[PDB]
Write a protein that binds this ligand. Structure first.
Ligand SMILES: Nc1ncnc2c1ncn2[C@@H]1O[C@H](COP(=O)(O)O)[C@@H](O)[C@H]1O
Ligand SMILES: Nc1ncnc2c1ncn2[C@@H]1O[C@H](COP(=O)(O)O)[C@@H](O)[C@H]1O
Lengths: 152, 152
């Protein structure tokens, strides 16, 4: 049945972490904070089909923002408006989570609040002194859901 | 727990029909088949935030097509390209289902295949002779999922 599949997936929400279902940083469709929204850029963004596009500055692992395709609704290409202005204006909240976070917990944090996307990071304790947060990718509500309803 | 909530929702996937979770036709964000895609129309479409927009001709209950926001990726507003050309070109498949269809079945039909949106219709047996299919709204995978994971 579907019932049984779903129940089992829900049973395994306890063990599994966000690192197991995440989209790793290299498979992620992202965009540079210095980008200009002109017909071709908005075109690539729309073509990607993703509702949410991480915004990075410098290295891809330095993620300062979140762009939503809806934010392009009122943008005119002829204006060649830089992405910075839109990220300042809407300023969508960025959520981070640890790679060891369990999926039930992630699901609970997804329910309360609007945010369906979280940046997955881990602690890198191998220094070079000061330990730093290392960004590994993104996880979404859809990732967790897909893990629940998938068959096996 | 979340586990228990999910399991119960899955238990009730048996009784519930698509009519119970659907977005009724009057709450639906739709668009006329005669529309022209120029900056303001594409703007409304993008502003709506919906991935999929039913395309109706004449009455809102006559649904000939499905527009996806991705289909606007390469469209230039200055061209004032009519929506008909894009619906002909991409021709996304339209799926229909009966209001009495149970949610487990709907979920199964959603898994196999690409389509996450179905037009919900029922048989209107009160004539006036020939019985006709009456369109009541739309149901999506997200509607069913939301019914699974919601609390109570
Ligand atoms: N910017 C992105 N790059 C790569 N994958 C993504 C991105 N956004 C979402 N996804 C994944 O693509 C799937 C559909 O998500 P979405 O189309 O954004 O609702 C899910 O598995 C997401 O985790
Ligand atoms: N064109 C539309 N008009 C009204 N509601 C919609 C439309 N498309 C999707 N929905 C509903 O809005 C929610 C989010 O769907 P979506 O943003 O399209 O992935 C779900 O409850 C859908 O059933």
């Amino acid at each position: 049945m579907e019932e049984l599949n779903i129940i089992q997936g829900a049973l395994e929400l306890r063990t599994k972490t966000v690192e197991d279902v995440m989209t790793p940083l290299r498979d992620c469709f992202m965009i540079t904070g210095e980008a200009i929204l002109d017909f071709n850029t908005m075109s690539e963004i729309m073509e990607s089909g993703y509702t949410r596009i991480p915004v990075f500055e410098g290295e891809r692992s330095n993620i300062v923002d979140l762009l939503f395709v809806k934010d392009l609704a009122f943008v005119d290409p002829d204006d060649c408006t830089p992405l910075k202005t839109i990220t300042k204006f809407y300023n969508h909240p960025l959520h981070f989570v640890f790679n060891d976070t369990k999926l039930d917990a992630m699901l609970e944090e997804f329910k309360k609040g609007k945010s369906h996307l979280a940046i997955v990071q881990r602690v890198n304790n191998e220094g070079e002194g000061d330990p730093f947060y290392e960004v590994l990718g993104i996880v979404t509500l859809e990732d967790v859901i897909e893990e629940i309803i998938k068959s096996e």
